[PDB]
RNA sequence: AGAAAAAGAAAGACGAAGCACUUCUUUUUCGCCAGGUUUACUGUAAUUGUGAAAAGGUUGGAAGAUCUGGCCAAAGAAGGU
């Protein structure tokens, strides 16, 4: 960060984010909002992608629900892929079990990508069936 | 694979500026097949038909011969009168 590095800032931030900085229900924030503005809205992704890692403030399901929609709202690439994969991965809102028809597929429908996104994680835990035609 | 993050892109209806501001809701990226959905028609093989050039006197059956003298040649390859 004295060496003004909004990236190698950014990057040590998820890196120990990783590496177990603390989560406490309020050091999940702390970390997210000190790496938030970090000269990259890719940077804010991250945070929010360490976020979703430890999952202390990213059990607010319908909190990450309205994040990445303002994400994927402005077409934010990094913030939509990381956000809804560890969401439905931590169960929060990427799909369900009556309109997940709708919110999965609408993920995919949403722009001519992060349907490989979902490919990436989103397809690998579609469970948008218990059947083969899905 | 070992565990040692990853790396991506379309239109339509809705507010708005009479479009774009993006926010909700569906849309497709050929292994090799096969008609077609009209082509912006124009530069880039060729066939066949066309494809130029003045007159006079002489002998002879008849001139292309002859004497006098002009014209074409990217045609003086040839073939008949």
Same mark, same amino acid.
């Given at each position: +960060?004295? =060496? $003004? #590095?909004?990236? %190698? &800032?950014?990057?040590? /931030? !998820? *890196? @120990? ?14 970390a ?14 991250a ?19 309205? +994040?990445? =929609? $303002? #994400?994927?709202? %402005? &077409?934010?690439?990094? /913030? !939509? *892929? @990381? ?14 079990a ?13 722009a ?16 948008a069936?218990?059947?083969? +035609?899905?």
């Amino acid at each position: +960060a004295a =060496a $003004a #590095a909004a990236a %190698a &800032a950014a990057a040590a /931030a !998820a *890196a @120990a984010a990783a590496a177990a900085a603390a989560a406490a229900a309020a050091a999940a924030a702390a970390a997210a909002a000190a790496a938030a503005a970090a000269a990259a809205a890719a940077a804010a992704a991250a945070a929010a992608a360490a976020a979703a890692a430890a999952a202390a403030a990213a059990a607010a399901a319908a909190a990450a629900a309205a +994040a990445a =929609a $303002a #994400a994927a709202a %402005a &077409a934010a690439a990094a /913030a !939509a *892929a @990381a956000a809804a994969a560890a969401a439905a991965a931590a169960a929060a809102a990427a799909a369900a079990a009556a309109a997940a028809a709708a919110a999965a597929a609408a993920a995919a429908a949403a722009a001519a990508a992060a349907a490989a996104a979902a490919a990436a994680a989103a397809a690998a835990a579609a469970a948008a069936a218990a059947a083969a +035609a899905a």
